[PDB]
């Protein structure tokens, strides 16, 4: 099997169809010139290709910027690929585990937009944990 | 003619501390923590703690060391606060 | 949005308690109903519920834990209700058992009663038989079994009526009786025969298997949670067998040793105590064999006097509790084999023990029931009554105790069964069992008014 | 005041003082009794009959040395003469008989002031007056009120009780006259009884009189076993050991009604009596026994209620022996016929009125009909024409004028009904001013003022009504005072009868005692329920049966229940009753809202979440506002169900009021009575101690009698339990306090008794002695109080357990001190001591049960008796215990016939030695135990008994050193394993056990062991140890093989035999030069025996040995020098004592140098140690002279501190509990 994908960047990416069918949308249009892939660039594509070929049955694979990880989670949202989503959410979870709210604010570039009375009274009831 | 012998050794560890061997300063004085921010809010509770193993430390020193590791530093015995006569 | 819940799903409860303080949108994503529903049900609270019927599942998760803490403080103090099964005139209590808050008791006149300790009502019916003394009684979630002195055995179904569904007859006395905690099989030990009774597909209560032993049986238990064929464990003097009803097999676990003094069977392993003996004395011990292969796993004991009781099937995982003749209760670690707690609780021998994740309840031969909190290493309370403590059984919110005879005190009695309830907001208005009911609506209204008059926590 | 030092506390800030003697009589036992008044001050009075012994025992200052003419009456047939006559002392007293009754009667009809004050100033006179036939027939209204004022003056009390908690009734004068008559008759009969065949008649007359009084009073005031229980009330109620003709009381309750029948009915009933009971019927016979069978009484009851009046039947119904053997006119009467006949034919009216005053229920219904204008003008004319009749006044007008006082408060004003009401009220109040008085008491003045004086001009006679009401304003308060005085007198009399039944044991025969007590002890909320889905089942929500429910039929969320409240009723509690049996029919979220009408329902009040395990759900607590309509909406069921099921509702309004005064009186009187009886008993217990063996029967009799009274006369069990608790707490607490407290010599009665119980068990006394002692001590401890219900718990916390425990502790301590003083030097001290301690424990558990407080008291007693020993005696005892444990451990390597018994004895000895925990002898015990365990561990491999003993007696060691020794013994095996592995991997068997300071008592190791070819292994091990983590000593042992012999020697022997094998003969010179040992003589000693291979052929220089015992030619040869035991008396213990005496002075110096503020203990220890090591004041001379015993740990200083705290030289701060300071 060999099928081509027409990416956003204009480049064509041909890959063996069967193991790549883990995305339900591409196989859907397959059994229903390449298929247009208009939402994400090539780097995510080859990332997921070498990932799916590696995973038949990726810690270091994701040691990249935050932006590209967001782009890949949104791609797997469009791709509907269980593995990419599971592993990226697992690594983000293990990233956020064991931290202070301000350590979260450092973690995900989110500014503390809570007033002081709100900051106190939120951590008086929520203490139980 | 000798077939079995049970020899006994003796390991000497003679070190007269006379000081809190955690922070190495005096035992009746204050520890490094209470010596840095001296008299800021309260300092009248930097007291001494005696262990069953017959060693004495500042309360702060040995408390945080126990937070780290759960034996006595000098003898490697399971730490236990001395409550005999207290 | 689903990406947010995909990120937060793996997030534990602890840091979820913090992520609700960094934003308003992060607050409303940290208060999701599905996440808290999952955290609650997966933690045990409210199993058979639906995410629809309640709202703000975080506050429900808070309230359940607050209720559990209140229950624990009710245990630490003595807050709740207490009741006692009334004395039967001119008779003596002979045997007591209880499965799930339902007690069964047998007296030295042939009488057998049951009474549910979970209701505001009060019916303690007598179980009919169509003169000898009762030897043993056992109760199940559905069945009741009684063994008499003349070698007879009655079996009642607690869901149909107060008349026996099977009446078996031996040739000699009965030395031991056991009832399956989950299934519906019965096991008895006559002079030299051990037999298992069980219903066939049409429910006719036939004989499943028969065995033979060379000595008299002293202890007999049934292994819980067996798939197809039941398995029993018998202790004949200084021998210990393993009876399998598949092909009537009789394996031999342990032989050529001192006599056995106690016995307890869990789903996977069996624990039993043996005396100490010899010209050069060998101390008393507790042995723990495995039922998979019959291989001994542990051999515990550092005691000068014999062991008298052991509990393994109720203990938390990797722990076991025991009571000795010197009056001490001990906690044994099953991984390392060492002691975890040795506590001098009684004056005479210890006759009943039970433990859970934070407390121990033990009853002695002098008549005392004592409660200890081994997490903080502090006593909680104790209660003294006349005769030796013969039965003890508690749950997370209730306790059942029996003092059975063999001038002892000022308050005289001839057998006393007492129930303690540490959460009165769970007592029902009538019993789930059809037989534990009445028809005199006068008494119904009387106890209904009494229930409505009781104070609140 | 006069006796202030004899007050008895009745509670928190409430005491009782003896005041004064009042009366005197002879008791039922022939002896004199004395009535004594007590005063209750935080002022009420209590009268108590006391004998001479109780007076001596409670207030002895009331003892001292011993126990504390004719024509003047004829000329009146001219009143000043009679007044001056009655001025004399005995004149009126003697003239009581000759018509002075009629004389003072006609005189009463301010001149009567003297005539009525003379004799009254100088009880039977007023009784003679009050039953005069012409008292109310021939007299006016003014002299009537004068007589009533006289009576109200006569029946006053020096200390009444508050009555402003009950609705006092309004009654005319005749009711007060009859009440005063009955009251004075009862008082006369009572005082006759005090100053006295004939007495049986007196008691019968008294019982009937008081029965009649109770009946009249109650009618005048119109007053007519399994269960869960709280866990704190488990053992709070005292326990009392359990145990065909009508009784005299029950037969008198029936004779009371038989004695009020009419001639015909009386004759017929006496005939029915004579039928079964053959013979004659005499007055002295009908009452004496007249034993009736139950069947005769039952048929008599079945025929009685017909031939009675209305009041007689009202009494008979509530009776005890009965509760045991039991046009507008026509349109109103439709709901009686005699009322219509009267309304029509109102001359045959007199018979109708006569038959009406016997059963005036229709009359009362008619007058109550007034509170629609139809029948009012029809019945007001009848009333106004009935007032004009001679004997119609007898009807109960006062009982039906609550209706009339509702029309004068109604919106209808200036009408015709008001004019006729005013006219009728005017007629009724003018024919007799008594009704003016009852109206003034009702409040008619301001009522008619605000009702007519604002609207119209006195429609018919309203001004005159207001005038008459304001006139009888004065008599209103007189009437109130009279009735309240009679009520208080009757209450005091019933309390007196109760006390008399307690003192004596005669039963109570007064007819309506139980009914009166019940009345004295006891002083829907919704219109409709409307549900949405199923209307024909809503009755089951309030059915009061939980087996029946209301099931809904509708959509999810549309179910609700609507409650229409009644006016003014607030909501105290609202609960919903559900059952977890219904799985999906159970509610899951309830919302309760309140509004003014079914249409608005705007403000919701509460929202609740129901859990899967819930039965009683509280929806609303005690509210403040009133809500007309309350709706309960069930939002969703469990598991998404669609229909709901409810088992019940429960609405509770405000709490009722019950006048809590008589209850307090009952509890006060019971408490004081028993607190006096207890002090009376304690004197008998104190003068002859042997009498203690009878106290249990007395206490049990008292409790049984109290229970028998409560189970017969009190209303419910909530009162019986309170009275039982009060009786127990008042009777037992002072008895215990008395028999527990010591005397001039220092022994108490109970202490003496327990000492006899203990010391007489050796064997004499006999078994019944022991049984009785056990019964007493078990009775005394069987009640545990909680740390009506508020009345029984009135007072301080109990002190029974405290006194008992301290007495037992003192007994135990005296026993142990006698034992230790007698025999502390014996050879068999430890076994006898442990047997004694076991006997003490057994006797404690069989005297008080296995209760924790008494075991603690026993342990404290032994620990206190051990601390009275000087230092050297405690040292000797500790050493003996350690040596005994050592011998018992070692004697197990070789078996025995009875080993289980030996191990049980060892267990008892360990239980005995556990007392040392936390005392100051623990350090000495640990010292000797280390010294012996060390020699035990290095002579054999091990025993399993070591860990078994340590598991028991671990806490007894302040430093936990034996545990460390055992642990190190285990660790060395692992170290040798690792060394063997590393040796065989990094390519004469030896085993190395390495000691240290923090794991072994290295204080007696001075020498140090190279002589032979084994240095290689030792150096290899030294290198391995220094790499993976040293010095060798002269301890250990070796197994050697010598030809056909196998050996077992020490190290200081192995090396010597090696040197003898490496040469021909060796002398002592090279021995000492190479070794350094000082010891060696005892080492080469055991070789001289026949088993020893060597012969020490002493040189003619110093000595020399050679193997010459091998010429005369098996199994183990244990040629190891045996162990010797220390001696606490010798130079060992004396150095320890000197060290302790030095540390004491050091500690007190350093503490005196810091003042009253004190010193923290953990810094005191550091200062003492740093002053002991580099000691300028304790010069190093003595510190060196001590030798073995010159080392100081922290536990030594802590033991000296405990010693000083015990002596009192030191003191612990109260605020900061572990800061010490010098005392004195
Ligand atoms: Zn320090
Ligand atoms: Zn500090
Ligand atoms: Zn240490």
Numbering used by the authors:
A (entry chain S): 2 to 33, 43 to 67, 89 to 160
B (entry chain R): 23 to 108
C (entry chain F): 121 to 250, 259 to 534, 546 to 596
D (entry chain C): 5 to 46, 62 to 87, 114 to 122, 140 to 171, 175 to 187, 197 to 270, 287 to 314, 461 to 479, ...
Give verbatim lines from the article.
A cryo-EM reconstruction of a recombinant human CRL7FBXW8 complex, prepared by coexpressing CUL7, RBX1, SKP1 and FBXW8 in human human embryonic kidney 293S (HEK293S) cells, refined to 2.8 Å resolution overall. The density allowed fitting previous structures of RBX1 and SKP1, and building atomic models of CUL7 and FBXW8 de novo. CRL7FBXW8 adopts a diagonal T-shaped structure. CUL7–RBX1 forms a ≅160 Å long bar that crosses the ≅115 Å long CUL7-FBXW8–SKP1 base of the ‘T’ at a ≅50° angle. CUL7 binds FBXW8 through an elaborate multipart interface that differs entirely from CUL1 interactions with F-box proteins. The CRL7FBXW8 structure suggests the mechanism: the canonical CUL1-binding residues in CUL7-bound SKP1 and the F-box are fully exposed and thus could mediate the interaction of CUL7 with CUL1.
In this study, cryo-EM and biochemical analyses reveal the CRL7FBXW8 assembly. Instead, our data indicate that CRL7 serves as a substrate receptor linked via SKP1–FBXW8 to a neddylated CUL1–RBX1 catalytic module mediating ubiquitination.
